[PDB]
Design a protein around this motif. Structure first.
Motif, PDB file in Angstrom:
ATOM      1  N   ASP A 195       7.974  -5.227   1.432  1.00 24.69           N
ATOM      2  CA  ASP A 195       7.142  -4.538   0.457  1.00 24.69           C
ATOM      3  C   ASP A 195       6.320  -5.485  -0.417  1.00 24.69           C
ATOM      4  O   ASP A 195       5.121  -5.270  -0.605  1.00 24.69           O
ATOM      5  N   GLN A 196       6.912  -6.569  -0.895  1.00 20.95           N
ATOM      6  CA  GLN A 196       6.137  -7.554  -1.641  1.00 20.95           C
ATOM      7  C   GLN A 196       5.066  -8.256  -0.812  1.00 20.95           C
ATOM      8  O   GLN A 196       3.920  -8.393  -1.252  1.00 20.95           O
ATOM      9  N   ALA A 214      -0.515  -3.128   3.855  1.00 22.35           N
ATOM     10  CA  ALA A 214       0.562  -2.153   4.070  1.00 22.35           C
ATOM     11  C   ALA A 214       0.903  -1.896   5.541  1.00 22.35           C
ATOM     12  O   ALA A 214       1.757  -1.057   5.839  1.00 22.35           O
ATOM     13  N   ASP A 215       0.250  -2.616   6.450  1.00 19.59           N
ATOM     14  CA  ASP A 215       0.525  -2.499   7.882  1.00 19.59           C
ATOM     15  C   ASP A 215       0.514  -3.838   8.608  1.00 19.59           C
ATOM     16  O   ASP A 215       0.588  -3.874   9.842  1.00 19.59           O
TER      17      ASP A 215
END
Lengths: 122, 122
Positions: free
Chosen positions: A91-92, A99-100
């Motif tokens: 996530d970081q 985001a992908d």
């Protein structure tokens, strides 16, 4: 002898994680490390000086492009905790890289009886 | 003299538990204490002021890592109640430390005739 001065050193919860960043641009890692330290030390209830972060300075090839990887060398936590850590790191990195983007996080178990600090094992 | 001002003090169900947290990080204990008090006082139908909680500040070593431990010094309840208490403490610690972490809970009985409050025993 063992080290009974530093607080909570031998706790089973203190996995002594060494994070190694591979195939990741240096500036990304430089930005990541302070925020990761904050989140992981909270999550694992572990001292901030229990973590080490390394940028590995090698050159990579893969067909289709090289994806970033974080190797975590540690004493081990249960699967569920390991899964949460993987999710935090991912996530970081996604925040800085997309985001992908396709981050790999790999945990490598070290044996406490093979890890020595000032000549004495864990 | 005995204390006939404070409500329900000498009930057999009032085991006067003192919980001592060993080999557990301070921040975890700090978070645990209010929720544990809520759950244990409900479970045992005991006044909230009948519980004490202590963070023990020592340094531990064990080969394989040190596991957290909660010592409960108390007057005693029957086995089945003791078992429920152990399960509450364990379940709350798991929420903060991991659903597969390995908590020890040990109960140590105190004799009522050896426990004095203001110079008079129970």
């Amino acid at each position: 002898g063992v080290d009974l001065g530093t607080e909570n050193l031998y706790f089973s919860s203190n996995a002594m994680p060494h994070l190694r960043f591979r195939a990741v641009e240096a500036h990304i890692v430089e930005s990541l490390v302070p925020t990761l330290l904050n989140e992981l030390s909270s999550l694992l209830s572990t001292a901030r000086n229990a973590f080490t972060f390394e940028l590995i300075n090698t050159q990579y090839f893969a067909e289709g492009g090289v994806y970033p990887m974080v190797e975590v060398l540690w004493f081990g936590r249960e699967q569920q905790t390991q899964d949460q850590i993987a999710q935090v790191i991912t996530d970081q990195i996604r925040q800085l890289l997309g985001a992908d983007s396709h981050l790999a996080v790999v945990f490598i178990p070290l044996q406490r009886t093979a890890y020595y600090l000032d000549g004495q094992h864990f």
